[PDB]
Amino acid sequence: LPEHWTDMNHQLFCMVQLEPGQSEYNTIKDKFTRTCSSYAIEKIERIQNAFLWQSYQVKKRQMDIKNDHKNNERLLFHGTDADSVPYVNQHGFNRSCAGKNAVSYGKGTYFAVDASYSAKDTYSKPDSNGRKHMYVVRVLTGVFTKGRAGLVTPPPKNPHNPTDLFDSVTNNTRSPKLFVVFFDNQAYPEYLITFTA
Ligand X SMILES: O=C1N=NC(=O)c2cc(OCC3CCCC3)ccc21
Pattern 62-81, ligand X, x by CB under 6 A: ---------------xxx--
Q: Which distant-in-sequence residues (6+ apart) come within 8 Å of 56 by Cβ?
A: 92, 138, 140, 185, 186, 187, 188
Helical residues (DSSP H) of the chain, grouped into ranges: 23-36, 50-67, 85-91, 115-118
**Partner in contact with 38, chosen from ligand X, a second copy, none, beta carbon below 5 to 8 Å by kind:** none
Q: Looking at 178, 181, 187, 193, which residue binds ligand X (CB under 6 A)?
A: 178
**Partner in contact with 112, chosen from a second copy, ligand X, none, beta carbon below 5 to 8 Å by kind:** ligand X
| Selected range binding a second copy among 56-64, 124-132, 137-145, 171-179, rule: CB under 8 A | 56-64
Q: How far is the CB of 105 from ligand X (least distance, A)?
A: 6
Q: Looking at 22, 62, 122, 196, which residue binds a second copy (CB under 8 A)?
A: 62
Indicate whether 170 belongs to the interface with ligand X (CB under 6 A): no
**Partner in contact with 54, chosen from ligand X, a second copy, none, beta carbon below 5 to 8 Å by kind:** a second copy
CB 49 within 8 A of CB 93: no
Q: Which distant-in-sequence residues (6+ apart) come within 8 Å of 79 by Cβ?
A: 112, 117, 118, 119, 120, 123, 124, 132, 133, 134, 135
